Fold this protein.
Amino acid sequence: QVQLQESGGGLVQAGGSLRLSCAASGSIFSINVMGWYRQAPGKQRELLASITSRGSTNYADSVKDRFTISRDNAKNTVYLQINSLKPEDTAVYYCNSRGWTTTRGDYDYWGQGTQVTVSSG
Amino acid sequence: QLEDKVEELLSKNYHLENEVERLKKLVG
Amino acid sequence: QLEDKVEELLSKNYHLENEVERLKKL
């Protein structure tokens, strides 16, 4: 089993930027994809960015040049840098850990998410 | 590796699931 | 067992790409 905890969000002026953090507990499986999603109230959840065990990244086209996913150099932690924030970027941002193993099959674990609120006058 | 290959195919799979989901709810 | 998974995902991804292609215009 695997457990994720996001942090780094909160309130921010439009034009700012945040580094969100997803701390991963438990086993780090040999086949794993860590993903960042967001969900605005009412709207459907939106996959923003993924990173594999070997550092290969996969972005949603709409944010490929504004958001950046990465992994800490040593810690069991992945980051999402979200730059040039606009009010439209207000949402809960969720981390997930997903894959498959020869022993237990598909797996899929979700964080509880960190709320980001982008303000303007 | 073969584990890297599955990881890449799964990453691709999840991206396509979400893109279809967004496109299904949008048009439907 | 791993190569079996590769073929499984190839087919799944292909059908998903075909849905994306159609549901785009439609």
Notes: Chain B is about 90% helix and 0% strand. Chain B touches chain A through 15 residues (CB under 8 Å). The CA atoms of residues 13 and 19 of chain B lie 10 Å apart. Helices of chain B lie at 3-27.
